Structure formats: structure tokens, C-alpha cells
Amino acid sequence: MAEYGTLLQDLTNNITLEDLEQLKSACKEDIPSEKSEEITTGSAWFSFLESHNKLDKDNLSYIEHIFEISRRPDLLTMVVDYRTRVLKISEEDELDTKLTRIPSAKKYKDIIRQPSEEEIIKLAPPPKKA
């Protein structure tokens, strides 16, 4: 999920305001013009997209299309290459399986799973004054 954030950020880094409008132009059919006005960045778009059902942490099919229909294979390439690269890392077997709440396979949330890994938390370099 983090790589995905950076992925979008990476193409966003290569995303020009002009290029975005091209994406937006292509997205005129998928994304509303009322929101296109505030899409001054790939981040602004992805954020809107994220805020909406246009872009999940792993769903880039619609965006990858934008990058495809638009004449900017450089951004698409990052998304495309990332798709496989992160997929090659996060080699999930239950990706094709639509099983959600399956205590017989999937793990329930009755157990409290904390995301704060305080074990390897000392490896972070925060800008706090000593």
C-alpha cells in the first residue's frame, strides 16, 4: 500500500499540470469536470480518486487506462512496472479469491491487530530535536 502511494507520487512527480489536464481530458468521461478544476496535481487527482471509488490502494485499472489513453507512457510505465514489481513482492495467492469474512481461512478482527510495530520502530529517523 505504501509503495502504491509512492507509485502514484512517482508518476505525479512526472505529472505536469499540462499533462494532468490531458489525463483529465481523457478522464472527462470518468472524472467530473467540477473536480477537474481542483486537479492541479496528480496528487490532487489521486487524492480525489482515493477519496472516491476511482482508486484503491491496489486498484489502478482506471488510472492505468488514463495513462494509457493519454500520450504519456512514462507515467503508465511506472504504474505498469510497479503493478508487477510490487505484485512480485506482494505475491498474494488469495488475490483472485473474493473471500472476505472467512474465519476458516481469512483472519477475523476479533483479535486486536496493532499496526504500530514498536519492535522495529527504533529504525525511524524522525526530525525531533534532541
Per domain, the residue ranges of the chain are 1-130
Method for this entry: NMR
Q: How far apart are CA 78 and CA 8, in angstroms?
A: 9
36, 24 contact by CB (below 8 A): yes
Amino acid at 4: Y
Q: How much of the chain is in helix, strand and coil states, percent to nearest 5?
A: 50, 0, 50
Q: What is the CATH number of domain 1-130?
A: 1.10.533.10
CA atoms 76, 80, 85, 86: torsion sign: positive
H or E element in which residue 70 lies: none
76, 54 contact by CB (below 8 A): no
CA atoms 30, 33, 38, 41: torsion sign: positive
Question: How far is Cα of residue 115 from the mean position of the Cα atoms in its chain?
Answer: 19
11, 75 contact by CB (below 8 A): yes
Q: How far apart are CA 92 and CA 125, in angstroms?
A: 30
Residue 48 grid cell = 480525489
Long-range pairs for 100-107: beta carbons < 8 A, 24 or more residues apart: none
Residue 122: DSSP 8-state:
G
